């Protein structure tokens, strides 16, 4: 059973957390429960707190350009973990288990997430993207503060520990039957219809789950569909400081067939939306830093009813795009092209129904494209 920890610089405070990532099925969010290991000596007269902060940030550090940055705290919560006070409530059988295996300088803390918060999502612009880097961070932070610092309004850095956790999006415990994500278009060319229909088994796919896209074309036209391309596009909309817009392809496939005049075809291609599908991890919405192994694509944004979408920071959504390259005519120079889209949601699977300590820092991807530091 792994447990993550990070030690203060001055060794006076040490945080212990059960997980690096906390689940959010639409109904509730795993609270953050852990323990702080204080050094009785280095922490005398001073009190130790633990805060949970969620903030949206905008701005990069690119040399020779006026520095520009924006921060908007979406949620803040602080709890005193020391000296012991019932500020955390009952104890977690995880906390108890830990307090024992650890010592008598181990105190529990518990921070909970409200329901009006987005999940982890961030990005970095690619070479030709006009926007700047931005994202939503979730920081857990334990810190020691004497009464002289409470006065002078400062929190000694040396005696503080910081952890950036992920709030990942999982599907609700139980949902009703899922209808198929269907749709059909009829493109008229010289009064002869070229019918197109695209459908998916369900409306909510999971990261890693193959998506079976079925394309059905009934070409009663005089032209020939030269090629059929199908891709998964990730549409991103920054909504807090700048209205940036990104739309990238995260998976794509094409059929070999062709659809001659007055003939039909029903083919079905399978795509798998994965960050790993491409080396360039810039210009797409991720749930973690580009340089980290465990980082995945951001899940579709779920906006609880009643809350203003702008509070979500960055809006992420997915769609399947079908591109039909249609042959011109007799003396064809160029060939036309019709495109169409079908929306679907993407997230992690439903939730589920001897300690080995390890460093919190996440391992880095070995060949993680390009990125700002």
Q: Is 362 domain-assigned?
A: no
Q: Is 370 domain-assigned?
A: no
The answer to whether 247 and 236 are in contact (CB under 8 A) is yes
Q: Show which of 173, 207, 233 is a domain's final residue.
A: 173
Residues 81 and 18 in one domain: yes
Residues 199 and 324 in one domain: yes
- Pairwise CA distance, residues 4 & 125, whole Å: 31
Residues 134 and 275 in one domain: no
- Pairwise CA distance, residues 362 & 366, whole Å: 12
Q: Show which of 138, 173, 208 is a domain's final residue.
A: 173
Q: Show which of 117, 143, 173 is a domain's final residue.
A: 173
Residues 99 and 203 in one domain: no
Residues 33 and 46 in one domain: yes
Residues 92 and 212 in one domain: no
- Pairwise CA distance, residues 210 & 215, whole Å: 16
Q: Is 360 domain-assigned?
A: no
The answer to whether 109 and 14 are in contact (CB under 8 A) is no
What's the CATH number where 331 sits?
2.60.40.640
Residues 2 and 146 in one domain: yes
Residues 215 and 252 in one domain: yes
Residues 143 and 55 in one domain: yes
Q: Is 344 domain-assigned?
A: yes
Q: Is 368 domain-assigned?
A: no
If we measure between CA atoms, which residue out of 360, 3, 359, 14 comes closest to residue 159? Answer: 14
- Pairwise CA distance, residues 353 & 185, whole Å: 41
What's the CATH number where 89 sits?
2.60.40.840
DSSP string across 137-194: EEEEEEEEE-HHHHHTT---STTEEEEEEEEEEB--S---PPPPB--EEEEESSS-EE
The answer to whether 298 and 285 are in contact (CB under 8 A) is yes
Q: Is 115 domain-assigned?
A: yes
Q: What is the Cα 286 distance to its own chain's centre?
A: 5
Q: Is 363 domain-assigned?
A: no
Q: Which domain holds residue 255?
A: 178-355
Q: How many domains does the chain have?
A: 2
- For residue 294, give the DSSP letter: T
Residues 191 and 106 in one domain: no
- Pairwise CA distance, residues 347 & 370, whole Å: 26
Q: What is the Cα 19 distance to its own chain's centre?
A: 17
- Pairwise CA distance, residues 80 & 35, whole Å: 12
Dihedral class, residue 208 (left if φ above 0, else alpha if ψ from -120 to 50, else beta): left
Residues 204 and 344 in one domain: yes
Q: Is 371 domain-assigned?
A: no
Residues 144 and 262 in one domain: no
> Could you tell me the resolution of this structure in angstroms?
2.8
Question: Pseudo-torsion of CA 40, 42, 47, 49, nearest 10°?
Answer: -100
């Amino acid at each position: 059973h792994v447990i993550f920890k990070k030690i203060s610089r001055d060794k006076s405070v040490t945080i212990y957390l059960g997980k690096r990532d906390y689940i959010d099925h639409v109904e509730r969010v795993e609270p953050v429960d852990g323990v702080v290991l204080v050094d009785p000596e280095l922490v005398k007269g001073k009190r130790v707190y633990v805060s949970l902060t969620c903030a949206f940030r905008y701005g990069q550090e690119d040399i020779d350009v006026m520095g520009l940055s924006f921060r908007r705290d979406l949620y803040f919560s602080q709890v005193q973990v020391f000296p012991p006070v019932g500020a955390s409530g009952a104890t977690t059988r995880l906390q108890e288990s830990l307090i024992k295996k650890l010592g008598a300088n181990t105190y529990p803390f518990l921070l909970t997430f409200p329901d009006y918060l987005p999940c982890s999502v961030m990005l970095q612009p690619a070479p030709q993207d006009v926007g700047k880097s931005c994202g939503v961070d979730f920081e857990i932070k334990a810190f020691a503060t004497h009464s002289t610092d409470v006065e002078e309004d400062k929190i000694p850095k040396k005696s503080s520990v910081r952890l950036l956790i992920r709030k990942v999006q999982h599907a609700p415990r139980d949902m009703g039957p899922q209808p198929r994500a269907e749709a059909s278009w009829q493109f008229f060319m010289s009064d002869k219809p070229l019918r197109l229909a695209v459908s998916l088994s369900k409306e909510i796919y999971y990261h890693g789950e193959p998506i079976p896209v079925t394309v059905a074309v009934t070409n009663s036209t005089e032209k020939t569909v030269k090629k059929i391309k199908v891709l998964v596009e990730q549409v991103t909309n920054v909504v807090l400081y700048s209205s940036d817009y990104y739309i990238k392809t995260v998976a794509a496939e094409e059929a070999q067939e062709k659809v001659p005049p007055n003939s039909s075809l029903t083919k079905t291609l399978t795509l798998v939306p994965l960050l790993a599908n491409n080396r360039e991890r810039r210009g797409i919405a991720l749930d973690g830093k580009i340089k980290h192994e465990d980082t995945n694509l951001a899940s579709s944004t779920i906006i609880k009813e009643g809350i203003d979408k702008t509070v979500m920071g960055i809006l992420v959504s997915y769609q399947i795009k079908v591109k039909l390259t249609v042959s011109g005519l007799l003396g064809e120079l160029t060939s036309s092209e019709v495109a169409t889209e079908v929306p679907f949601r993407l997230m992690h699977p439903q939730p589920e129904d001897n300690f080995v300590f390890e460093e919190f820092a996440r391992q880095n991807l070995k060949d993680a494209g390009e990125y700002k530091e």
